[PDB]
Amino acid sequence: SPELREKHRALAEQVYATGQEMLKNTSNSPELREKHRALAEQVYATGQEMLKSPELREKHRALAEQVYATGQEMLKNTSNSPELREKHRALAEQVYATGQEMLK
Numbered sequence: 001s002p003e004l005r006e007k008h009r010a011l012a013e014q015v016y017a018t019g020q021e022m023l024k025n026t027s028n029s030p031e032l033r034e035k036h037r038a039l040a041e042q043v044y045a046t047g048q049e050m051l052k053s054p055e056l057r058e059k060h061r062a063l064a065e066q067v068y069a070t071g072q073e074m075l076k077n078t079s080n081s082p083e084l085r086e087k088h089r090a091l092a093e094q095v096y097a098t099g100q101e102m103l104k
C-alpha cells in the first residue's frame with residue numbers, strides 16, 4: 001500500500017514535469033510526448049491498483065479518466081489547438097489538487 005502510493009506520487013510528479021515542459025512548446029518531440037503518455041499510463045494503473053473519503057477518491061478517479069480521454073484525442077494530432085491543451089491542463093490541475101487533498 002505505502003510503496004504503491006509513493007510509486008503513484010513519483011509517477012504523477014514526472015507526468016506534471018513532462019507536461020509543464022511541453023506546455024512551453026508549440027511542438028514537442030515524439031520522444032517527450034510518448035514519455036509523458038507512458039508515465040500517464042503507469043500513474044493510471046498504480047491508482048487503480050490502490051483500490052484493490054470514498055467521495056474524494058470517486059471525484060479524483062472520475063477526473064483522472066477525463067484527463068486521460070482528452071489525452072487520447074491529442075494523440076491523433078501532430079499539433080494540438082491551445083483550447084484542447086487548456087481543457088487538459090485544467091482537468092489535470094484538478095486531479096493533482098484532489099490527490100494532495102487526500103494526504104491531509
Ligand code: HEM
Nearest residue numbers: 005009012043044047048050057061064095096099100102
Ligand atoms: C491519472 C492521473 C492521476 C494523477 C495525476 C494522480 C495524482 C495523485 C497524487 C499527486 C496523489 C497524492 C499522492 C501522495 O502525495 O501521496 C494521489 C493520490 C491517490 N490517488 Fe491518484 N492520480 C491519478 C489517477 C488515479 C486514479 C485513476 C486513481 C484510482 C482510480 C487514483 C487513486 C489514488 C488514491 C487512492 C490516492 C490516495 C492514496 C492514499 O491515501 O494512500 N489515482 N494521486
Ligand code: HEM
Nearest residue numbers: 016019020022023028033037040068071072074075080092
Ligand atoms: C495526470 C495527468 C495527465 C495525464 C493522464 C496526461 C495524459 C496525456 C496523454 C495520454 C496525452 C497524449 C500524448 C500525446 O499527445 O502524444 C497527453 C498529451 C499532452 N499533455 Fe498530458 N496528461 C496529464 C497532465 C498534463 C499536464 C499537467 C500538462 C501540462 C502542464 C499536460 C500537457 C500535455 C500536452 C501539452 C499534451 C500534448 C502534447 C503535444 O501536442 O505536443 N499534461 N497527456
